[PDB]
Amino acid sequence: PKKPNSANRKCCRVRLSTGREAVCFIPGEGHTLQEHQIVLVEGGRTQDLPGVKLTVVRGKYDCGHVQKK
Amino acid sequence: CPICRDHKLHVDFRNVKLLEQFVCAHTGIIFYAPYTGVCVKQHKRLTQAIQ
Amino acid sequence: AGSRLETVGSIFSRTRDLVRAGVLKEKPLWFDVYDAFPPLREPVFQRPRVRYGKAKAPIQDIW
């Protein structure tokens, strides 16, 4: 992230159904996403990461719900 | 809400003094529910009793 | 109490209204005299402005 924060935020690059390729933040603690997997993305910018304006939806297609604690 | 917090306040067409509190004395219009805070259920009962 | 807002109204209007409102319990010693024998002008604060343009003082030269 940009100042004054510090972290390693888990992002992915997806090819959207429109054909454009964009970087999408994966929310939650722990993700099992691999290349060639299908995800549903939504809006909402990650205020830390400049230029990340998409978010992966947890619990749709391959991206599963975060595992309890 | 004001009506549901006191179980002794009965919304009845005969309890005219209670019903009067929920009507404008100067214009005669029944206050809409947000005005007094009564829930929709009690506002509907109050309106019917006033009529 | 009393009102120290000397630029709002006059000492009379302020005293009259506060006694009227019940803030001042007793009228001041001078109030009844002012009411009976008021001044020609009510002493209200005014701001002196300079004259611009064609505004001139009406004072005439004594000849």
Binding site: - | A25, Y35, T36 | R4, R14
Partner: protein
């Protein structure tokens, strides 16, 4: 060692750490800020763990007209005394844990619209129990000093009024918030306005005024309309005693300009009597709810003019576009005329 034990005052001063570098310049902020407990509170002189009963100290000196001798409470009796002592502590501790319900102002954590109570009585047996005080703004202003750097001060705006026309406001400044409240509250009662209320519920006419960059447009309203104005104006109106009014604040929403502008406009309103006297004509009120009945609200105390006021065919008056635009049904707003709680 018995010789290394300190007193309670020394032990608490060290443990609390109220004076230190951590508190000088907003350096350390801890929610877990430790609180002092007086450990001598519930202790009785002569009461110990062994449970001895000392005649004349722990227990009465004489019983049945005879001097008591040294005795010791039985094991089970001491257990009860010790258990009761634990219960008493828990109860006392419970009292401190309880939170008293504070009436919130405009917001949960906001100071605006909280009552400060009546102004303090004057030195000469003077009282202001009729007046009520309400905070309008609390600001943390700062200046820079050579020795300490940022010096934090509190600026507080409070209004006071008895609800019967007499209302005022003042600013109070102090390092402590309590001192700022007191100074503002006590100074406001010495700077009171008198507001002319029409029928003791509204203003005599519509007032449009600009104080610096703040614009206030107030409209006279009938009974039952309520206060449909800026939350700060609502607070001031309740202190003045105005029950029905509408006001729109435009331009800068500075609280000091708004308050000073409101009192400037309300103080400079012309009553119906003042109008009749100035014009030498009857002031006749026409009410729609009373049909064509002419209600004379004021008559000229002096002589009544016999010439009718000249009726200008077209009035050369400055109209506010916002008013005209609303009358023509051209003003759509999803935020106007929204249902709100009784004010």
């Amino acid at each position: 060692s018995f010789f290394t034990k300190l007193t309670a005052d020394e032990l608490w001063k060290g443990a609390l750490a109220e004076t230190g570098a951590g508190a000088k310049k907003g350096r350390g902020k801890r929610t877990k800020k430790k609180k002092r407990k007086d450990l001598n509170r519930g202790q009785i002189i002569g009461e110990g763990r062994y449970g001895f009963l000392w005649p004349g100290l722990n227990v009465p000196l004489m019983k049945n007209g005879a001097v008591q001798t040294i005795a010791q409470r039985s094991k089970e009796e001491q257990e009860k005394v010790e258990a009761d002592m634990i219960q008493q502590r828990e109860e006392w501790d419970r009292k401190k844990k309880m939170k008293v319900k504070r009436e919130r102002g405009w917001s949960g954590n906001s100071w605006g619209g909280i009552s400060l109570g009546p102004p303090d009585p004057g030195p000469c047996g003077e009282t202001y129990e009729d007046f009520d005080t309400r905070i309008l703004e609390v600001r943390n202003v700062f200046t820079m000093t050579a020795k300490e750097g940022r010096k934090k001060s509190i600026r507080v705006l409070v209004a006071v009024g008895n609800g019967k026309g007499a209302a005022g406001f003042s600013i109070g400044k102090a390092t402590d918030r309590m001192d700022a409240f007191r100074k503002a509250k006590n100074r406001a009662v010495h700077h009171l306005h008198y507001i002319e209320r029409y029928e003791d519920h509204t203003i005599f006419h519509d007032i449009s005024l600009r104080f610096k960059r703040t614009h206030i447009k107030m409209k006279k309203q009938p009974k039952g309309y309520g206060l449909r104005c800026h939350r700060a104006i609502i607070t001031i109106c309740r202190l003045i005693g105005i029950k029905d009014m509408y006001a729109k604040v435009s331009g800068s929403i500075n609280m000091l300009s708004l308050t000073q502008g409101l009192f400037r406009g309300l103080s400079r309103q012309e009553t119906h009597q003042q109008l009749a006297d100035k014009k030498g004509l009857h002031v006749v009120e026409i009410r729609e709810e009373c049909g064509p009945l002419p209600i004379v609200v004021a008559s000229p105390r002096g002589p009544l003019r016999k010439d009718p006021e000249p009726e200008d065919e077209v009035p050369d008056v400055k109209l506010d576009w916002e008013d005209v635009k609303t009358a023509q049904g051209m003003k759509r707003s999803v935020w106007s005329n929204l249902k709100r709680a009784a004010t």
